[PDB]
Design a binder for this molecule. Structure first.
Ligand SMILES: O=c1[nH]cc([N+](=O)[O-])c(=O)[nH]1
Ligand SMILES: O=c1[nH]cc([N+](=O)[O-])c(=O)[nH]1
Ligand SMILES: [Zn+2]
Ligand SMILES: [Zn+2]
Lengths: 374, 369
């Protein structure tokens, strides 16, 4: 059975170029003491950057911009060294969110074209999720969607939680969901914005990136999806299919609570927002939601499997965001092996469920099969 | 076997008195169209209050202050109708967090004494978690701890996530954790502050209380516990035992991700913050954390069980915050039955795991004799 990674990232060199030229987050900066440039993507990193600029003694801000971000050759090496046959690559956060409305469509088109060309270098081993110019008017977004569906190797759209600027329950976003669903493109929902920094308290900088990455990211995903659900997006766009990063963030754990809070909400019940034929979040989890297996534990994974089914879980690695700190960065990756281990521990090595999660679900759902049998 | 509810609240009548004397949240107010007063506790309800104070046409703010909040008779009725033999009651959010430092210790002392008296009305059926005057100096907080440990029927402490005002990873809070743990009092950690309201976006009003209650609360709990763990609180206070509201919020689901982010953090590894003998979050989950079973689904519950063990899970109802909306409020509560059903579905009816979770864990852990 073929192993497929559906959660794996790149920044093309032209995108990195943009980041090096930016004055505010997201940006890339080189420091005299460091031997790699710094990638600075998050609001949480803002303080450490200010300190690093004002003081040469202070710690390096953000994270290392390793060669893995831009190197297709290293992406292929990672895949070989980690037993991965196919990658569905996506542009990383924050995609095109920071671009001015006028420039966005042109840049998105160029970058999506680059990804198609990247995939063409290793026929059958590479596919991609395209990113959209969501800062531009909805009509430009629609035209951008039509273009990417006709790009070789494109198998979906990656997007963040901000939508057009008002989140995913913004009714102006509905025709974007419709256009993507009608094009039969899987929507890969991915965090970036996290939670306002104050929630982590005055000692947050002591804990590294642990709180914003381990908590802020999955919580953002849950809030965005819950907002979509409450707004009736899944009912208004019935053919919409979504892949959720990090096994839905926390959704599989909180689904029962969300359901209880809905049926016990006085305001919602008495204004008719809780009818009897209402499609529950459980139904949506089985019908319109796919979950990645980037969850690192058989505990989380089992919850995800119970929520969506073994045929709706897809292995990912989140390469290259979590490199080994003390081992060879070109050898096997712990962050990848933990997720594979979680699969084996949860459903058994060599089982049909193991084969499904590890690649066959992605092969089926993302129509990679005709390309694999060639 | 005995059914124990460890997650169940009351406001004593005098506490309600303070609430309609308050000009800012938390507050109680009566509105023309419903003689049942409105309980307004949360930052999320602030907008709907301002709308209702200006326009007599806008929706009633907060939630109904039913008789189930202040009446001990109603508490016992709820218990009898829902098959609950024992309740470990606690003062509900926001406890004493809003009180001035000078008035706090005296008020806590009075309220904690009331709770002890209420428990005495139904011997063997009622115990309580005591609340602390955390807006007061640490010394007054320690004095309150020594007092509540000698109150009949007290079995632990309930506390929120703000601590002294800077969260639970505040070093000044370390002596409080030490005193509580040395007194062999279980700490029940409970949400209130949730998340800054902007995260719910501009349509939040349309979804009722769903986002702040279903998401904000358990996420607040997760962040607070994670901060405690990262600051080494559990290693500094090895005898500390904590009960986490709503099955740890989201902790059982994110524990794997937390571990991964720690061992892959460059700054932490390079500054010696990830030694090899390090106690993992899994270890702490098995040794110093108990989880309530207020999770509403066998899916969540199974993750909690896998995280802490079946011997560290405890049934709760969250009475009286989720009454039936169209069913008889004097009948069985769905919000309680959903959690009982989740136990049955996860471990099987009549099993020893079932009996443990439904009450025997609480009996053992909290010495309910
Ligand atoms: O900056 C980032 N941090 C973390 C992740 N990730 O874990 O999905 C990511 O994709 N991007
Ligand atoms: O105001 C509140 N809303 C909800 C809960 N609860 O469900 O834990 C609570 O304890 N207090
Ligand atoms: Zn990612
Ligand atoms: Zn509660």
């Amino acid at each position: 059975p073929v192993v497929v990674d559906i959660h794996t990232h790149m920044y093309p060199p032209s995108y990195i170029a943009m980041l090096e030229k930016r004055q505010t987050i997201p940006l890339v900066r080189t420091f005299p003491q460091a031997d790699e440039p710094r990638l600075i993507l998050l609001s949480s990193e803002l303080a450490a950057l200010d300190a690093a600029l004002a003081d040469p003694a202070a710690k390096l801000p953000g994270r290392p911009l390793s060669t893995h971000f831009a190197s297709l050759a290293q992406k292929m090496h990672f895949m070989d060294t980690n037993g991965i046959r196919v990658s569905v690559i996506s542009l990383a956060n924050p995609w095109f969110d920071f671009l001015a409305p006028d420039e966005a469509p042109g840049i998105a088109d160029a970058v999506n074209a680059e990804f198609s060309d990247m995939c063409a270098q290793h026929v059958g081993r590479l596919f991609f999720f395209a990113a959209l110019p969501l800062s531009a008017p909805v009509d430009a977004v629609k035209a951008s969607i039509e273009r990417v569906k006709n790009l070789k190797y494109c198998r979906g759209i990656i997007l963040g939680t901000s939508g057009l600027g008002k989140g995913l329950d913004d009714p102006h976003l509905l025709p974007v969901f419709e256009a993507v669903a009608d094009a039969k493109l899987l929507v890969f929902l991915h965090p970036h914005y996290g939670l306002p920094n104050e929630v982590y308290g005055p000692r947050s900088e002591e804990y590294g990136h642990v709180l914003p990455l381990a908590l802020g990211f999955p919580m953002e995903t849950t809030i965005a999806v819950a907002r979509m659900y409450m707004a009736g997006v899944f009912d208004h766009v019935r053919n919409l299919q979504m892949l959720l990063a990090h096994s839905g963030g926390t959704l599989p754990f909180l689904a029962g609570r969300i359901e209880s809070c809905i049926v016990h909400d006085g305001h919602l019940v008495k204004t008719g927002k809780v009818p009897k034929d209402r499609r529950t979040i459980w139904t949506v989890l089985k019908e319109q939601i796919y979950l990645d297996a980037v969850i690192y534990s058989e505990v989380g994974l089992q919850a995800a499997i119970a929520s969506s089914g073994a045929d709706r879980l897809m292995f990912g690695t989140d390469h290259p965001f979590f490199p080994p700190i003390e081992e060879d960065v070109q050898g096997p990756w712990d962050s990848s092996r933990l997720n594979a281990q979680a699969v084996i521990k949860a459903v058994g090595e060599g089982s049909s469920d193991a084969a499904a999660v590890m690649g066959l679900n992605a092969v089926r759902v993302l129509s990679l099969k005709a390309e694999l049998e060639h």
